[model samples]
Target: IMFFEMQACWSHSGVCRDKSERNCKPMAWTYCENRNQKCCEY
Candidate 1:
């Protein structure tokens, strides 16, 4: 690596109120914070 400057990264973890979102079936990704925020993709 010559002064390598090529980076491929991804990190997303948004969750609030370790108690919320009582419904989630294919509708999320709005900054995930509508009662529940559970996401994964790295």
Candidate 2:
């Protein structure tokens, strides 16, 4: 098995604190593919 770190950030609220804040959304299938089978465990 392999482990990977998925860098992610969550907003404390639905509001953006900074204009540069990353618009992180739900992970896509491609990102999961990058993690291989391990992604399914998440």
Q: Count backbone clashes in candidate 1.
A: 1
Please list the Cα RMSD from the true structure of every candidate, rounded to 1 decimal place: 11.1, 11.9
Give residue 42's lDDT in candidate 2 (0 to 100): 23
Best by lDDT: 1
lDDT of each: 0.31, 0.29
- TM-score list, all predictions: 0.16, 0.16
lDDT of 2: 0.29
Task: For candidate 1, write residues 1-42 as lDDT tens digits.
Answer: 345322221223333332343543322332333334433221
Off by over 4 Å in 1: 1-19, 26-36, 40-42
What is residue 29's positional error in candidate 2, in angstroms? 31
Candidate 2 at residue 17, lDDT? 25
lDDT by residue (tens digit), candidate 2, 1-42: 336444322212222123232443443232222322322212
